[model samples]
Target: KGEELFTGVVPILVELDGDVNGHKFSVSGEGEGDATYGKHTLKFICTTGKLPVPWPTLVTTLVQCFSRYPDHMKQHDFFKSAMPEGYVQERTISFKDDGNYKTRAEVKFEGDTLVNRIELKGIDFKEDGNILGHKLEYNYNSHNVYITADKQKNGIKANFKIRHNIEDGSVQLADHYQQNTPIGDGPVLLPDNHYLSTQSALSKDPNEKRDHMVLLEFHTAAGIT
Candidate 1:
């Protein structure tokens, strides 16, 4: 009975959670622990909205979006504001086995009302263990919200890239090209400066088709004042 009980018990265990402004926040698990060694770690990060004073309009837009995308906003506090017209705040949580491992998170805000951008980067790793990565980025122009994701290797990777270009009052897909070849269908309404015709060296291949534009008026009307 003792041997059976010992073998039946799963040795691995983990717990993680967080809060912001006194409100409890939730964080998703990233990796698993070794059942035998019981040598594993977990990480959690939380960020909250911080709008600048005098930008009530942008703040209102963010609050609405936050309400609409509760799940996304919960994970990305920056999105709560939707646009970086004011100050920014971030929060992080982490746990790890002994031995001085490393876990990091950073937030930065740039641009202005006309073209605001936000970048976030996070990494949790040990000198001798596997790496876990997570990243979220956003770009807001007068018209739309551009979002990107870089989640690799347990949802964290340094180079994984995702980008959204919001313009003309909507979130329109930007032209995505790889090796001068189209990787996916182009946006419906091509952004002004993203047209293949604008490229200095145009490909002569007849098989190559120019990218489409992304109209942003609807998105703009829905969010921007």
Candidate 2:
């Protein structure tokens, strides 16, 4: 551990298209520090900005906000929340490629846990298989987002998560677990897992300037499906 050093606060001009509110963070690293999230950034900035607020208090409050963005975005004045309920309600996201993998989810708050029921259809890969649904039970109190993927037409059952061992990203799926699970009585045919990491979350119109992201995946694997 290190000792405490001098500390202070100052105003900042956050030019983020002028739409956003309190955050739940502070973090930083090397590679390409494009203000992703960190410890120093938050401690240094939000404090001295046009007398918005000061350190200690401002810092402490921001962490609380970022911890629960959707809920706290409504608590502060710096941002706006247009979402339906206290949760994600309903949303459809489709990334077009070989075919449009249009995935939809319905997030509902059940007690303290947020249950996300996801469904997708016509996704061909492992076999001629498609059509499936699953549930992610996110309990903030327990900080556990458990994923239980429903079985597919080929006796395929998969699961992953997004809120542990990580400040971000999805849960770990059973890659080889299917080996014994039996996919419709055959060796694994479909991709064991598929996921996307966003470089930037800005959604821009196809006709205009938009942010971009990259996909790192297995083009093909050796297996008789």
Candidate 3:
């Protein structure tokens, strides 16, 4: 309720139905996140073959309700074609609640092609020792999905994607661990890169083995291409 969302009021049940460009875009609430019962999330259900530019922006806005990001910085939004391609936008995103980061996010938007790099240090990126990096490049203006890379210091790199397919009305998620090498401690190297891959459907199933590789296509269709 405290969040200043699109309409200025955070709706527990979000159902945004409208049309963008020549396409019909729908966003329905997927429910709350974590124990906070907040972090309201919605998925885009589009009628056309591809999603409009505003779809991803709108989806991110829904996360604002429970997001712990700094309230002042408003750099996370769509880019106009008029925006300089060589222009690099930088913002110091201070932690709001300090759940993970202790200080700030030295966020940098490299050029105008949706390439964004943000460094979130549990305490401090350079001085505090360990750092969790976030590197993602997304341009729904040209595509329907965003790609990301995750780093596990003690382990190896993993891949994750948040994809919404317009033709199928499916909000898909794909997570791939490259090195099965002890996602935790004690265990030695992992099975195989794709040894444990869960399909979007199986990954969401409540009864299925949560940590599993459903044995198909390595998941992420949208993230890859």
Name the better of 1 and 3 by lDDT. 3
Q: Each model's C-alpha lDDT?
A: 0.20, 0.19, 0.24
Per-residue alpha-carbon lDDT of candidate 1 for residues 54-171, written as tens digits (9 for 90 to 100): 1111111111111122222233222222222222222121213211111222211122111112222223333332111111112322322333222221111111011223223433
Q: Once all C-alphas are superposed, what RMSD does model 2 give against the true structure?
A: 22.6
In model 3, where do residues sit more than 4 Å from their true spots? 1-11, 34-57, 61-63, 69-225
Best by TM-score: 3
Which candidate leads in lDDT? Answer: 3
Better of 1 and 3 by TM-score: 3
For candidate 3, lDDT tens digit of each residue in 137-188? 2222112222221224222233334343323342322221121111123322
TM-score of each prediction = 0.17, 0.21, 0.22
Better of 1 and 2 by TM-score: 2
TM match of model 2 to true structure = 0.21
